[PDB]
UniProtKB/Swiss-Prot annotation, chain A:
Record-listed ATP binding positions: 42-49
Superkingdom of the source species: Bacteria
Protein name per UniProt: DNA polymerase III subunit tau
Keyword ATP-binding in annotation: yes
Annotated residues for binding of Zn(2+): 61, 70, 73, 76
Oligomeric and partner information: The DNA polymerase III holoenzyme complex contains at least 10 different subunits organized into 3 functionally essential subassemblies: the Pol III core, the beta sliding clamp processivity factor and the clamp-loading complex. The Pol III core (subunits alpha, epsilon and theta) contains the polymerase and the 3'-5' exonuclease proofreading activities. The polymerase is tethered to the template via the dimeric beta sliding clamp processivity factor.
Full-protein positions shown: 4 to 368 of 643
EC number assigned by the record: 2.7.7.7
Mutagenesis or variant effect for residue 115 to D: In dnaX2016(Ts); present in both isoforms, unable to grow at 42 degrees Celsius
Keywords, sorted A to Z: ATP-binding, DNA replication, DNA-directed DNA polymerase, Metal-binding, Nucleotide-binding, Nucleotidyltransferase, Transferase, Zinc
GO biological process: DNA replication; DNA-templated DNA replication; viral translational frameshifting
Enzyme class: transferase
Curated annotation (Swiss-Prot), chain B:
Key words, A-Z: DNA replication, DNA-directed DNA polymerase, Nucleotidyltransferase, Transferase
PANTHER family: DNA POLYMERASE III SUBUNIT DELTA, REPLICATION FACTOR C / DNA POLYMERASE III GAMMA-TAU SUBUNIT
Name recorded for this polypeptide: DNA polymerase III subunit delta'
Reported function: Part of the beta sliding clamp loading complex, which hydrolyzes ATP to load the beta clamp onto primed DNA to form the DNA replication pre-initiation complex. DNA polymerase III is a complex, multichain enzyme responsible for most of the replicative synthesis in bacteria. This DNA polymerase also exhibits 3' to 5' exonuclease activity. The gamma complex (gamma(3),delta,delta') is thought to load beta dimers onto DNA by binding ATP which alters the complex's conformation so it can bind beta sliding clamp dimers and open them at one interface.
UniProt GO BP: DNA replication; DNA-templated DNA replication
One term under GO cellular component: DNA polymerase III, clamp loader complex
The protein's Enzyme Commission number: 2.7.7.7
UniProt source species: Escherichia coli (strain K12)
Catalytic activity as recorded in UniProt: DNA(n) + a 2'-deoxyribonucleoside 5'-triphosphate = DNA(n+1) + diphosphate
GO molecular function, one term: DNA clamp loader activity
InterPro entries named in the record: DNA_pol3_clamp-load_cplx_C (IPR008921), DNA_pol_HolB (IPR004622), DNA_pol_III_delta_C (IPR015199), DNA_Rep/Repair_Clamp_Loader (IPR050238), HolB_lid-gammaproteobact (IPR048731), P-loop_NTPase (IPR027417)
Superkingdom: Bacteria
From Swiss-Prot, chain C:
Keyword annotations from UniProtKB, A to Z: DNA replication, DNA-directed DNA polymerase, Nucleotidyltransferase, Transferase
Gene (UniProt): holA
Subunit field text: The DNA polymerase III holoenzyme complex contains at least 10 different subunits organized into 3 functionally essential subassemblies: the Pol III core, the beta sliding clamp processivity factor and the clamp-loading complex. The Pol III core (subunits alpha, epsilon and theta) contains the polymerase and the 3'-5' exonuclease proofreading activities. The polymerase is tethered to the template via the dimeric beta sliding clamp processivity factor.
Role according to the record: Part of the beta sliding clamp loading complex, which hydrolyzes ATP to load the beta clamp onto primed DNA to form the DNA replication pre-initiation complex. DNA polymerase III is a complex, multichain enzyme responsible for most of the replicative synthesis in bacteria. This DNA polymerase also exhibits 3'-5' exonuclease activity. The delta subunit is the wrench that will open the beta subunit dimer, which has been modeled to leave a gap large enough for ssDNA to pass through.
Source species: Escherichia coli (strain K12)
Protein name in UniProt: DNA polymerase III subunit delta
GO biological process, one term: DNA-templated DNA replication
Keyword presence, Cell cycle: no
UniProtKB/Swiss-Prot annotation, chains D, E:
A GO BP annotation: DNA replication
Whole-protein coverage range: 3 to 368 of 643
Residues that bind ATP: 43-50
Record GO cellular component, one term: replisome
Name of the gene: dnaX
EC number per UniProt: 2.7.7.7
Protein name: DNA polymerase III subunit tau
Keyword Nucleotide-binding attached: yes
Length: 365, 334, 338, 366, 366
């Protein structure tokens, strides 16, 4: 078992972060209001097709049409496995389909073999070849009772208004970092697998809003490192320094050490750091600090390693200033690719925070 | 495509794993331009594509070695981007995927190489992944990229990232003294003006570039003490304007660093310059100029066709107003 | 080598067509008319084939030989027009021309055309070779003193009574574009079938026609009052003049002021103008400009021109005209640091 | 079985909203028979460009005659409103896998119309046509047959060469006003006998930006997730945008300068899955309304009444100068947002700044 | 059945608007039998280049004789006007699809006309002819048959070589004065008994850039959208307007401090569908000029006239420090704009900022 497959949500109960979009489908199934076609939008990665399945699962089930599909019946097992007679799946991105959309949409008006509905899950509907496309519109304005359409697309804009108006389309949003972090944790706790705090952070942030990938990365961390989701392993796949460099840089910067700031930048450079990644860490550090200055409990989980240093800055540097550094660096990140070289970009910035330093570098003849 | 000396220590452990089994079926090498990124991939594949290897290298005779010296081979697959376009296709990938799905023609190992993975289509990335998940027994892969972050996190997780680090400066300079006779002081400057890449350093000299660069420092040395920055116009106004503006920037940086007492300097070539510069220009004045030079260099590179002449004349004259007492220099935006 | 003026050609051409005709000068109209006069006389003979080959310091000896083969293997009356380089023939060209010069004969009329050759370029093997067989027609834009004289001559053959003041008016407008002065004379003849081109008449038609050179904007923009420059600028959108072509007319004269104002105590205004080779009456006007535009004004005007230059190339359609108005206003009034 | 986006899909030229002058224009020509061979409809996506193009072809081929008032029953009318008509060739120049790209479908042009009077060619965003099939359109436009007519659409009229623009009768479809969509949504909901809260409609009216299609689509989601009611608590949640009380307390937290409370509201907010960008927006607008009310106490909107007592309090107690700072801090913070290391963080930092730079009391130091 | 642009095609030299010295020259030459082999007409696309060429071809061919006053009745005149005369051979180098291209058509140049005194070749955008055919035209002009005339016309005369410019009589056509076009629109409508508001014709005269041909088609469109009338509203429905613009009355209202008026203006402006950022440009471009009239009174422009007194009043009654202050406040508000929750909101708040940080009469607080 790999935690990518083993955690495919089986009920809306265990889906993560799409709150409304499920409140509308759970209510839809509960009361009995199921429309001719559902259009799911959102970027690749988000539960589009996953939540699509769970819909058909709540429709075909032997315990009735409920938002709570039994996970054991003969229908559910076959739905989740991805091998159901009535849940026909068509991927519009593939060039080698057996009987292309036109032939699978030919049988539309025919009865459902096992179940109340003959559901059609089409992924990337905007990629469909034209002659089959209109075939849907013959059915959409006058579709049989036994048929249902589950549509998915990375881009709605490439779907003609003829279809976007006949469907009840739902937009699935990305997930915040912490939202993914929190789920990963929960899975690793219940699964009894060794994990660290900074790891789950690095893992979540790496998966950009997709729990799907989040887990697939978590699985390669388990294979690459020890059977332990450790910071060492995680930053081994991704490529984070795994060093206190971002912090010491901040510490130097704020004392107006230049010599050491430029020094650190150099050593840093020698280990092939991703300059933007470095700036991001610094911004994140500058942020927690300001949080600590507001409510002293803000220093988190694996950040216990810094605690002392972090807090020392909190009590010694003016918040007014802490904002100033943050700002100056943020800006730096925007102009970063404007710079002739990414490193000189980083030097441009940090030297900048050193000068526009209260009680720092001054001019002369 | 020339085997450099620093490529050895890395090449050692990379075969040391292909001999003891620890070899990773997917390898992503990150390295600066002209760091011999080229030669390391090729040198590694010749070791795995040998029918009768002699220990650390090949024999030269065997079918592999021969068809290898002949380039054309049934197990070597070069995945260069589509000729004409600056990206790679989802097609090329699929056709090499299934190409490996069948037994190796010479009965042994099969190898794949990418020019730069950061140049492929997003769909091309995914299309490649599934194969690394379903690894055809005893096959080998070699990714390569200057920037591994601009690569899909799910993809760079499947491969083993290996940092091809620039060799120690003392070694890079000696190697360089051979390829071109120039003062070591110059040699080091080139090296530093290449992030340590000895290959790029070397190429810095091969045009008349260096001479073009010497013209710049002479002009600068006149202007710095005189104030007449508009004299650089002749030195900068040229199609090579951006490469030149960058040069002028490194000198600006250095002077800035010296104000903070930073030991390291890129332009070791002319310490007398960075000195005077830093002397006549406050760390603020320098900041100001550094930027305009910076943003102006970019409009030249990016915007389709502005007046190289006007823009620069404007940069120049503008630099001189920052130098005048009482003027309130600029601050970055957003 | 009968050295002669554009007017003298038609008479000579009557006596006998020569071996080669070199048309050396800068006037587009003069060169063309002389060229047309030669050919019109040739095609009358039997000169069916006509050719033109342009010599560059970049052209291959292989191109010269390839041409020779073309000319030498053709059996009948043909013509060849050598277009001399913009700068004039270099050390190498003098040879390639020389090789060509040895490709002549009665049935191969050579016509060379370019600007005036330097007394040096005139000693050159190729030139001295034709020096007994050929004719040289000096096509040079008539100087300030004879521009009026040329207009009077050209007008008189068009059966026109062109008054002196009028003549001057026509000259001060279209100064130097002989093609324009000729059209203008011909248009002016349709207007007053009468023939009598008096100052009042000519003045009315010239001002009414309202063609303003983008230079008149600048010429006005030289610290001359903005009213007329704003007028000309908003009258320059009525002749269909692109903005971009205006910015590079302003730039050229603006950067020129920058360099000159910069050279006060470097060399007295006098010699500097010669050095830059544009001082052609513009001198008193250029200096009048230099005298009331501060080192700093000139600068500010350079930033504006730059923004505009980018604004026009970054959104590629941000109504630069507005900025041109704003720009024309800076060259007349003292600015601030805002 | 009906989602408003389809049940109210304009059938007549009268049913379309607010773009009077483009409807009037087409009314004249469909009456006087002044048909141009090429009609260009420009404007943002979401505005009825394609939608209004249909009602033209619905009066061009209609069996009742060339009408500005088509009959919704004739076979031609029904088939047009359903996307499928023999002669109405709808080409999307933004698609990558068409059966035969525009150059192929344009090859036929010279051919006769099988059912309708005209062989209409609805093309969405022609400035993205392949340079190959673009010239085909040129060649057909210079000299087009009497039976063929074009209906061009675009999101950016400037990416279209002057050679084409000059050949079509251009029409700019403006984006509808907020309270023009709001007013529409209220009416539609009032006619469907569906409950609602007015501050919910404004959010839906803003949600879609001048795109009535989208407003309806948006209103159907809201219905499905609020179980029969278009309530602020069902809507505010789709957009991930705070109820004007959640948002209003944040603003108050900030102004009283108590930090814990702010981070607490932000945490409690994260729990219900916000759209961090939105939490900034609502706060800006809220700050905006308070600024207006200090000028004209009559400024507050009608559904604002729930928070009217609080909005009004701040208004008289907080100096406009200060209110300008909070609005600036929060905006600038919006500029930053994509560069912040994390969206949720950009928002926290933008706020911790307002706190550190608070005018009446700020974060202290030794 | 009649579109103004088509209905007012000039039928004689006598009625083309304002290109007097072109028309006289042509008309005198037409009376004295003085006609050159070829004429080049130049000017921006819009002026009547091709249209004057017609009347001249129409002049050279009228069955009455060679005249400056062709009767619009004989068959020659009627056909030339409909552009279907045997002998008025018309090419347009601009398109890529001509049946037989210029080279072929120019081949038969020495063939006498089938009707009427001259065979007139009218070629639009000669500077666009392919070199293959251009040279064909070059040879013809060197030795043109006395029975043929070339009426060439171009948008870019510069692009032509001296070879051709030296063999034609150039005639430049100046674009029309705005107050020249308006007077002509005013007249056409009156003769047509079509209702119109004085502001409306100006919003059109401005629109058509220097050309009547365009004004007419714009007005034809205006009619169809205003359904019969030419009202400022239907005309402002397509063409962005200036009377509704408080651009100077907003600044006045600003520096005068009566927010009441300042907002009333903004709502008014809003009802008209303004491009919010342009308004901030107009304000920033105005404040900058008022800054200039304070250092030199020669800062009053080519159409500053109506405004004059209003600007001149500000230039003296407003401190330069304060002018800078307002210039800055609007400058900043321009940058903040696209990030505001709503563009109108930005403007409204930007002014509220000027209003909060005003030198005299700033907001009160208890
Ligand atoms: Zn079940
Ligand atoms: Zn071997
Ligand atoms: Zn009908
Ligand atoms: Zn007649």
């Amino acid at each position: 078992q790999v935690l990518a497959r083993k955690w495919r949500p089986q009920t809306f109960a265990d889906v993560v972060g799409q709150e409304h979009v499920l409140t509308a489908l759970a209510n839809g199934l509960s009361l009995g209001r199921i429309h001719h076609a559902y259009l799911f939008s959102g970027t690749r990665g988000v539960g589009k097709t996953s939540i699509a399945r769970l819909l058909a699962k709540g429709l075909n089930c032997e315990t009735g049409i409920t938002a709570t599909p039994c996970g054991v019946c003969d229908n559910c097992r076959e739905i989740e496995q991805g091998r159901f007679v009535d849940l026909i799946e068509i991927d519009a991105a593939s060039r080698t389909k057996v009987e292309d959309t036109r032939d699978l949409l030919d049988n539309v008006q025919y009865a459902p073999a096992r179940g109340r509905f003959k559901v059609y899950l089409i992924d990337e509907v905007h990629m469909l070849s034209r002659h089959s496309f209109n075939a849907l519109l013959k059915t959409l304005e006058e579709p049989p009772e036994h048929v249902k359409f589950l549509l998915a697309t990375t881009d709605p804009q490439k779907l003609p208004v003829t279809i976007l108006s006949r469907c009840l389309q739902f937009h699935l949003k990305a997930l915040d970092v912490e939202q993914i972090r929190h789920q990963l944790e929960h899975i690793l706790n219940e699964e009894h697998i060794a994990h660290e705090p900074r790891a789950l952070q690095l893992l979540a942030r790496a998966a950009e809003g997709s729990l799907r990938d989040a887990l697939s990365l978590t699985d390669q961390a388990i294979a690459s490192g020890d059977g332990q989701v450790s910071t060492q392993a995680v930053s081994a796949m991704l490529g984070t320094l795994d060093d206190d460099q971002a912090l010491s840089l901040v510490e130097a910067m704020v004392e107006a050490n230049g010599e050491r700031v430029m020094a650190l930048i150099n050593e840093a450079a020698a280990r092939g750091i991703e300059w933007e990644a470095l700036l991001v860490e610094m911004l994140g550090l500058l942020h927690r600090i300001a949080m600590v200055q507001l409510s002293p409990a803000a220093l988190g989980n694996d950040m216990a390693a810094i605690e002392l240093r972090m807090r020392e800055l909190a009590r010694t540097i003016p918040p007014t200033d802490i904002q100033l550094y943050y700002q100056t660096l943020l800006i730096g990140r925007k102009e970063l690719p404007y710079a002739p070289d990414r490193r000189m970009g980083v030097e441009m910035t940090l030297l900048r925070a050193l000068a526009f330093h209260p009680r720092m570098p001054l001019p002369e003849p | 495509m020339r085997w450099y000396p620093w490529l050895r220590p890395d090449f050692e452990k990379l075969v040391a794993s292909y001999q003891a089994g620890r070899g990773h079926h997917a390898l992503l090498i990150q390295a600066l331009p002209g760091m011999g990124d080229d030669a390391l991939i090729y040198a590694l594949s010749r070791y795995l594509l040998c029918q009768q290897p002699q220990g650390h290298k090949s024999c030269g005779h065997c079918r592999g070695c021969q068809l290898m010296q002949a380039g054309t081979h049934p197990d070597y697959y070069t995945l260069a981007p589509e000729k004409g376009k600056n990206t790679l296709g989802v097609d090329a990938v699929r056709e090499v995927t299934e190409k490996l799905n069948e037994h190796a023609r010479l009965g042994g190992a099969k190898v794949v190489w990418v020019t730069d993975a950061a140049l492929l289509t997003d769909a091309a990335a995914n299309a490649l992944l599934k194969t690394l998940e379903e690894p055809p027994a005893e096959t080998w892969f070699f990714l390569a990229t200057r920037e591994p972050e601009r690569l899909l996190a799910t993809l760079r997780s499947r491969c083993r990232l290996h940092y091809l680090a620039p060799p120690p400066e003392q070694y890079a300079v000696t190697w360089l003294s051979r390829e071109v006779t120039m003062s070591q002081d110059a040699l080091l400057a080139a090296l530093r003006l290449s992030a340590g890449s000895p290959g790029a350093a070397l190429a810095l000299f091969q045009g008349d570039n260096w001479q073009a660069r010497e013209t710049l420092c002479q002009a600068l040395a006149y202007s710095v003490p005189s104030g007449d920055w508009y004299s650089l116009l002749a030195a900068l106004n040229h199609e090579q304007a951006p490469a030149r503006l960058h040069w002028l920037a490194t000198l600006l940086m250095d002077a800035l660093k010296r104000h903070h007492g930073a030991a390291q300097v890129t332009n070791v070539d002319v310490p007398g310059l960075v000195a005077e510069l830093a002397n006549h220009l406050s760390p603020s004045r320098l900041q100001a100029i550094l930027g305009d030079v910076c943003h102006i260099r970019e409009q030249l590179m990016s915007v389709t066709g502005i007046n190289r002449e006007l823009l620069i004349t404007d940069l120049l004259l503008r630099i001189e107003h920052y130098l005048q007492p009482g003027v309130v220099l600029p601050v970055p935006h957003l | 080598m009968i050295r002669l003026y554009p007017e003298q050609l038609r008479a000579q051409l009557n006596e006998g067509l020569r071996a080669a005709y070199l048309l050396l000068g800068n006037d587009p109209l003069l060169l063309q008319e002389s060229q047309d006069a030669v050919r019109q006389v040739a095609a009358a003979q039997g000169f069916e084939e006509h050719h033109t080959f342009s010599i560059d310091p970049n052209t291959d000896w292989n191109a010269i030989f390839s041409l020779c083969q073309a000319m030498s293997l053709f059996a009948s009356r043909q013509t060849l027009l050598l277009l001399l380089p913009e700068n004039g023939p270099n050390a190498a060209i003098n040879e390639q021309l020389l090789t060509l010069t040895g490709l002549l004969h009665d049935d191969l009329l050579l016509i060379v055309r370019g600007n005036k050759l330097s007394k040096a370029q005139e000693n050159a093997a190729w030139f001295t070779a034709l020096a007994n067989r050929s004719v040289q027609v000096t096509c040079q834009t008539p100087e300030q003193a004879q521009l009026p004289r040329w207009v009077a001559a050209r007008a008189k053959q068009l059966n026109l009574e062109l008054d002196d003041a009028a003549n001057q008016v026509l000259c001060y407008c279209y100064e130097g574009n002989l093609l324009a002065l000729a059209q203008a004379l011909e248009r002016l003849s349709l207007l007053w079938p009468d023939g009598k081109l008096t100052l009042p008449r000519v003045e009315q038609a010239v001002n009414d026609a309202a063609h303003f050179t983008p230079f008149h904007w600048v010429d006005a923009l030289l610290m001359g009052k903005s009213k007329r420059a704003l007028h000309i600028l908003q009258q320059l959108r009525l002749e269909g003049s692109e903005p971009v072509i205006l910015l590079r007319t302003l730039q050229r004269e603006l950067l020129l002021l920058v360099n000159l104002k910069r050279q006060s105590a470097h060399t007295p205004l006098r010699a500097l103008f010669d050095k830059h080779r544009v001082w052609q009456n513009r001198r008193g006007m250029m200096g009048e400009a230099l005298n009331r535009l501060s080192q700093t004004q000139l600068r500010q005007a350079v930033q504006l021109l730059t923004r505009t230059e980018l604004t026009l190339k970054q959104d590629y359609g941000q109504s630069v005209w507005a900025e041109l108005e704003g720009l024309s206003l800076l060259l007349c009034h003292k600015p601030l640091a805002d």
